[PDB]
Amino acid sequence: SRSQRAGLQFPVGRIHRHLKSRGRVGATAAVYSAAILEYLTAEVLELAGNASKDLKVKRITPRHLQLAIRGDEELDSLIKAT
């Protein structure tokens, strides 16, 4: 896929369609956008899967997401500015 070319899990073409729905939108804008969104999802997820004293969470619930985001000065401030 085009997402694989960019080395990502996020849908580049779908993100391109979403950007257009919000004049031309180029592939680079869609690729850069998917990459940053994938980055933040991975940062939030990494922490939530490790939101334990044993660090082993079997299933991520909204408590883990609150521990992940609130447990991080930068994610907390990002979500709050939004």
Partner: protein
């Protein structure tokens, strides 16, 4: 000097006061009773103007 000094301090301060933000945002970050596991047209969909000359 200690690489482990103040280990949990920052979090204990954060925990001192309730955050109403995490109670309302996106429906609130609270566990529900009956909160099941997430299950499992998945692939990317590409328009004609994806690879236009930028």
């Amino acid at each position: 000097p200690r690489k482990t000094a103040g280990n949990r301090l920052s979090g204990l301060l954060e925990a001192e006061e309730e955050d109403e933000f995490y109670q309302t945002t996106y429906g609130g970050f609270t566990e529900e009773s009956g909160d099941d596991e997430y299950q499992g047209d998945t692939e990317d969909e590409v328009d004609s103007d994806f690879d236009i000359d930028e």
